[PDB]
Design an enzyme around this catalytic site. Sequence first.
Site, PDB file in Angstrom:
ATOM      1  N   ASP A  19       0.809  -1.216   0.000  1.00 12.84           N
ATOM      2  CA  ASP A  19       0.000   0.000   0.000  1.00 12.84           C
ATOM      3  C   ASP A  19       0.843   1.267   0.000  1.00 12.84           C
ATOM      4  OD1 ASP A  19      -1.989  -1.942   0.495  1.00 12.84           O
ATOM      5  OD2 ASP A  19      -2.369  -1.223   2.529  1.00 12.84           O
ATOM      6  N   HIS A  63      -3.294 -15.842  10.227  1.00 18.34           N
ATOM      7  CA  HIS A  63      -1.868 -15.597  10.021  1.00 18.34           C
ATOM      8  C   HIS A  63      -0.975 -16.180  11.112  1.00 18.34           C
ATOM      9  CE1 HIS A  63      -3.448 -12.103  12.221  1.00 18.34           C
ATOM     10  NE2 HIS A  63      -2.258 -12.053  12.794  1.00 18.34           N
ATOM     11  N   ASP A  65      -1.613 -16.955  14.555  1.00 19.65           N
ATOM     12  CA  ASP A  65      -1.884 -16.735  15.980  1.00 19.65           C
ATOM     13  C   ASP A  65      -3.396 -16.900  16.245  1.00 19.65           C
ATOM     14  OD1 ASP A  65      -1.294 -13.096  15.690  1.00 19.65           O
ATOM     15  OD2 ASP A  65      -3.000 -14.344  15.085  1.00 19.65           O
ATOM     16  N   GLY A  71     -10.795  -8.820   7.334  1.00 20.43           N
ATOM     17  CA  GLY A  71     -10.977  -8.079   6.090  1.00 20.43           C
ATOM     18  C   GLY A  71     -10.972  -6.585   6.338  1.00 20.43           C
ATOM     19  N   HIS A  78      -3.270  -5.552  15.791  1.00 19.81           N
ATOM     20  CA  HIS A  78      -3.207  -5.997  17.175  1.00 19.81           C
ATOM     21  C   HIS A  78      -1.753  -6.262  17.551  1.00 19.81           C
ATOM     22  CE1 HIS A  78      -2.440 -10.423  17.001  1.00 19.81           C
ATOM     23  NE2 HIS A  78      -2.725 -10.192  15.728  1.00 19.81           N
ATOM     24  N   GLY A  87       5.766 -12.245  22.067  1.00 16.74           N
ATOM     25  CA  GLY A  87       5.632 -11.084  22.945  1.00 16.74           C
ATOM     26  C   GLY A  87       6.238  -9.856  22.291  1.00 16.74           C
ATOM     27  N   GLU A  94      -3.442  -6.425   6.519  1.00 14.03           N
ATOM     28  CA  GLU A  94      -3.181  -6.039   5.138  1.00 14.03           C
ATOM     29  C   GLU A  94      -4.457  -5.721   4.353  1.00 14.03           C
ATOM     30  OE1 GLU A  94       0.222  -5.524   3.609  1.00 14.03           O
ATOM     31  OE2 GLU A  94      -1.430  -4.299   2.854  1.00 14.03           O
ATOM     32  N   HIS A 113      -0.318   3.392  18.691  1.00 19.67           N
ATOM     33  CA  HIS A 113      -1.209   2.625  19.556  1.00 19.67           C
ATOM     34  C   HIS A 113      -0.705   1.189  19.744  1.00 19.67           C
ATOM     35  CE1 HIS A 113      -5.413   1.368  20.895  1.00 19.67           C
ATOM     36  NE2 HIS A 113      -4.922   0.217  20.469  1.00 19.67           N
ATOM     37  N   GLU A 114      -0.352   0.519  18.646  1.00 18.88           N
ATOM     38  CA  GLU A 114       0.122  -0.863  18.738  1.00 18.88           C
ATOM     39  C   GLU A 114       1.400  -0.987  19.550  1.00 18.88           C
ATOM     40  OE1 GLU A 114      -3.233  -1.767  17.387  1.00 18.88           O
ATOM     41  OE2 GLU A 114      -1.820  -3.319  18.015  1.00 18.88           O
ATOM     42  N   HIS A 117       0.811  -1.096  23.162  1.00 18.13           N
ATOM     43  CA  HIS A 117       0.583  -2.481  23.589  1.00 18.13           C
ATOM     44  C   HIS A 117       1.894  -3.277  23.697  1.00 18.13           C
ATOM     45  CE1 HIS A 117      -3.755  -2.230  23.393  1.00 18.13           C
ATOM     46  NE2 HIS A 117      -3.828  -2.235  22.075  1.00 18.13           N
ATOM     47  N   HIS A 123      -5.867  -0.646  27.036  1.00 18.68           N
ATOM     48  CA  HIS A 123      -6.739   0.369  26.479  1.00 18.68           C
ATOM     49  C   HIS A 123      -7.200   1.396  27.496  1.00 18.68           C
ATOM     50  CE1 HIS A 123      -7.769  -2.354  22.843  1.00 18.68           C
ATOM     51  NE2 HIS A 123      -6.793  -1.513  22.553  1.00 18.68           N
TER      52      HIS A 123
HETATM   53  O1  LIG Z   1      -4.730  -2.844  19.259  1.00 17.45           O
HETATM   54  N1  LIG Z   1      -5.806  -3.267  18.489  1.00 17.45           N
HETATM   55  C1  LIG Z   1      -7.024  -2.881  18.850  1.00 17.45           C
HETATM   56  O2  LIG Z   1      -7.233  -2.201  19.844  1.00 17.45           O
HETATM   57  C2  LIG Z   1      -8.161  -3.303  17.962  1.00 17.45           C
HETATM   58  N2  LIG Z   1      -8.906  -2.138  17.524  1.00 17.45           N
HETATM   59  S1  LIG Z   1      -8.480  -1.303  16.221  1.00 17.45           S
HETATM   60  O3  LIG Z   1      -7.769  -2.179  15.332  1.00 17.45           O
HETATM   61  O4  LIG Z   1      -9.677  -0.782  15.612  1.00 17.45           O
HETATM   62  C3  LIG Z   1      -7.510  -0.056  16.555  1.00 17.45           C
HETATM   63  C4  LIG Z   1      -6.119  -0.152  16.395  1.00 17.45           C
HETATM   64  C5  LIG Z   1      -5.293   0.941  16.666  1.00 17.45           C
HETATM   65  C6  LIG Z   1      -5.849   2.149  17.095  1.00 17.45           C
HETATM   66  F1  LIG Z   1      -5.064   3.215  17.354  1.00 17.45           F
HETATM   67  C7  LIG Z   1      -7.228   2.260  17.254  1.00 17.45           C
HETATM   68  C8  LIG Z   1      -8.050   1.164  16.980  1.00 17.45           C
HETATM   69 CA   LIG Z   2      -9.668  -5.478   9.380  1.00 15.14          CA
HETATM   70 CA   LIG Z   3      -3.472  -3.316   2.071  1.00 21.48          CA
HETATM   71 CA   LIG Z   4       8.803 -10.711  20.044  1.00 21.82          CA
HETATM   72 ZN   LIG Z   5      -1.715 -11.455  14.612  1.00 19.81          ZN
HETATM   73 ZN   LIG Z   6      -5.516  -1.688  20.914  1.00 25.59          ZN
END
Ligand SMILES: O=NC(=O)CNS(=O)(=O)c1ccc(F)cc1
Ligand SMILES: [Ca+2]
Ligand SMILES: [Ca+2]
Ligand SMILES: [Ca+2]
Ligand SMILES: [Zn+2]
Ligand SMILES: [Zn+2]
Length: 158
Positions: A19, A63, A65, A71, A78, A87, A94, A113-114, A117, A123
Amino acid sequence: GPVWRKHYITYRINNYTPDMNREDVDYAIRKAFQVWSNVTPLKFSKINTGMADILVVFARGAHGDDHAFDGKGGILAHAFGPGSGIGGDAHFDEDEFWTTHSGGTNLFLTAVHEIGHSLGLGHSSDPKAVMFPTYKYVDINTFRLSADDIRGIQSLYG
Ligand SMILES: O=NC(=O)CNS(=O)(=O)c1ccc(F)cc1
Ligand SMILES: [Ca+2]
Ligand SMILES: [Ca+2]
Ligand SMILES: [Ca+2]
Ligand SMILES: [Zn+2]
Ligand SMILES: [Zn+2]
């Protein structure tokens, strides 16, 4: 919960979304790590071979996990909390259309955001926080963590 118990953290980009331009993927991810190193003692380094702490993956559907993607739309990405093996890893769906701008889904914003985590954050209920679990585009050039994000991460590091 779990945190990284060391200051030098590595990441690796497993594969690249078609992309985006390759250099733009690298830069979006680099900038997303910088957001968190700005407010912690952590240092992040990209490695090109071997085992990284945080593997960045683009994949669709099932994929390998327990978190199959769905989609276009819905779950965008995540990530797993700090630990061995998978971890720390961050997976991006994608079936989204990743971009550098307001179109599609912004990779940088999603990655901030990811990576939260990947560092051990959960959250937030605060709509202003990057850790709020609903995607909403904001201007990336002037992006700032919310007070909630900063207190969350500094409760874990520094
Ligand atoms: O960590 N994954 C999630 O929390 C799942 N929700 S998400 O993909 O819509 C999403 C992902 C990242 C963001 F910043 C906001 C929403
Ligand atoms: Ca999706
Ligand atoms: Ca894509
Ligand atoms: Ca790792
Ligand atoms: Zn995954
Ligand atoms: Zn999240």
